[PDB]
Amino acid sequence: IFPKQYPIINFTTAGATVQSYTNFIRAVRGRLTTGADVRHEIPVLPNRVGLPINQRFILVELSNHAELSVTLALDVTNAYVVGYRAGNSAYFFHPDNQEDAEAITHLFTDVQNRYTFAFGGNYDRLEQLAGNLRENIELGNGPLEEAISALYYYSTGGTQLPTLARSFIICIQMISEAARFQYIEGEMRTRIRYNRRSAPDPSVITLENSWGRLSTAIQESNQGAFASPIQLQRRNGSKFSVYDVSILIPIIALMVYRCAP
Amino acid sequence: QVQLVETGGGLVQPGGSLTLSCAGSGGTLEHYAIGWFRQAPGKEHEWLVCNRGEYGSTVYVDSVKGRFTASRDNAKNTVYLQLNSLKPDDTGIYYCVSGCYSWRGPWGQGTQVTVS
Ligand SMILES: [Cl-]
Numbered sequence: 001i002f003p004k005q006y007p008i009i010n011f012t013t014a015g016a017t018v019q020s021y022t023n024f025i026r027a028v029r030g031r032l033t034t035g036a037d038v039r040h041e042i043p044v045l046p047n048r049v050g051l052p053i054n055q056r057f058i059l060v061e062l063s064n065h066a067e068l069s070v071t072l073a074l075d076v077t078n079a080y081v082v083g084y085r086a087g088n089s090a091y092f093f094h095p096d097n098q099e100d101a102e103a104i105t106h107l108f109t110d111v112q113n114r115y116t117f118a119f120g121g122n123y124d125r126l127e128q129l130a131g132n133l134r135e136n137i138e139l140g141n142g143p144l145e146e147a148i149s150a151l152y153y154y155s156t157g158g159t160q161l162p163t164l165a166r167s168f169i170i171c172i173q174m175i176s177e178a179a180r181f182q183y184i185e186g187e188m189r190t191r192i193r194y195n196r197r198s199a200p201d202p203s204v205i206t207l208e209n210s211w212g213r214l215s216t217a218i219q220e221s222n223q224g225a226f227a228s229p230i231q232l233q234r235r236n237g238s239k240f241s242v243y244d245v246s247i248l249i250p251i252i253a254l255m256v257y258r259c260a261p
Numbered sequence: 262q263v264q265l266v267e268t269g270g271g272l273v274q275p276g277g278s279l280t281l282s283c284a285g286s287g288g289t290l291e292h293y294a295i296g297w298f299r300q301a302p303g304k305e306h307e308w309l310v311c312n313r314g315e316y317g318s319t320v321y322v323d324s325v326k327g328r329f330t331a332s333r334d335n336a337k338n339t340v341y342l343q344l345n346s347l348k349p350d351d352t353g354i355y356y357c358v359s360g361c362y363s364w365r366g367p368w369g370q371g372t373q374v375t376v377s
Contacts, residue, residue, distance in 0.1 A: 101362035114366035118294040118316035
């Protein structure tokens with residue numbers, strides 16, 4: 001009776017389309033936010049503090065052409081992947097603190113084998129494990145299709161650690177970052193439109209790196225205006241500054257909770 | 262499939278030492294974190310150590326800090342917990358799992374430690 005069933009959003013790489021991918025990212029955003037908290041037109045993610053554990057997580061079920069299924073657990077507060085589940089085994093990133101350690105105990109309670117990596121899920125660490133930086137790692141339906149397969153086979157013993165790290169960077173950007181950023185989502189749609197694999201450019205990468213900063217700048221903003229500008233990059237890697245909220249609205253879909261409204 | 266078997270449990274006297282072994286079988290635990298928990302009668306499981314890598318530094322709960330020591334022999338594929346200066350309140354069954362600071366999931370038989 002007890003174990004909590006978290007919302008499940010299904011997506012499959014098999015015969016995937018721009019439409020079905022857009023529908024996927026919207027459903028994920030739908031589950032991550034009620035949309036109850038909005039500052040400057042941007043939906044805010046639920047406050048981690050005081051958050052009941054039944055509202056804490058959502059599940060992403062991934063399927064590919066190979067007919068393999070892999071389930072990801074996403075933290076509703078940061079919209080980030082805390083770990084995943086394949087068959088009878090579950091795997092979790094090393095938690096950043098004892099409360100998060102406690103939280104993930106409510107996940108994947110029906111698996112036989114439960115594992116916690118010695119490493120966390122941040123890009124830097126994941127990049128060291130993969131042996132490749134995000135700028136050298138391709139994104140698209142192909143890679144995601146490949147990432148799904150590698151996640152599944154890791155229990156098998158059929159996936160090398162670097163490959164597993166590579167697949168995480170793939171999954172995380174193509175799902176979490178897509179959900180956080182309409183722009184990033186838009187960059188993934190473009191890969192699907194053209195059936196291309198491409199590693200993300202500086203414009204995408206600095207969005208990922210600045211996400212926390214932007215949420216803060218937006219929530220602390222005075223009538224939309226920043227105290228200090230934030231530097232971002234054009235697709236060509238050239239810098240440019242954002243002094244205010246209006247410019248970010250088409251860009252960032254979700255904000256981490258910083259201050260109360 | 263990697264699994265863990267605890268060993269080293271015994272009966273000890275106050276101030277004594279003991280050495281527990283968490284042995285992996287069907288693969289490397291090298292990149293897995295390994296926690297140690299203990300349960301005492303009429304009491305809930307409590308977390309003792311978090312051993313990461315290699316990788317991260319090793320975390321101890323304050324009460325066992327400097328008393329208890331974790332180490333790894335890679336290729337022996339085992340995580341050790343060396344218990345030192347044991348008190349009767351260190352009594353209980355000791356479990357090793359891959360996880361830290363909080364656990365439900367299977368333990369595990371554990372290996373018994375009695376200090377009298
Ligand atoms: Cl880390």
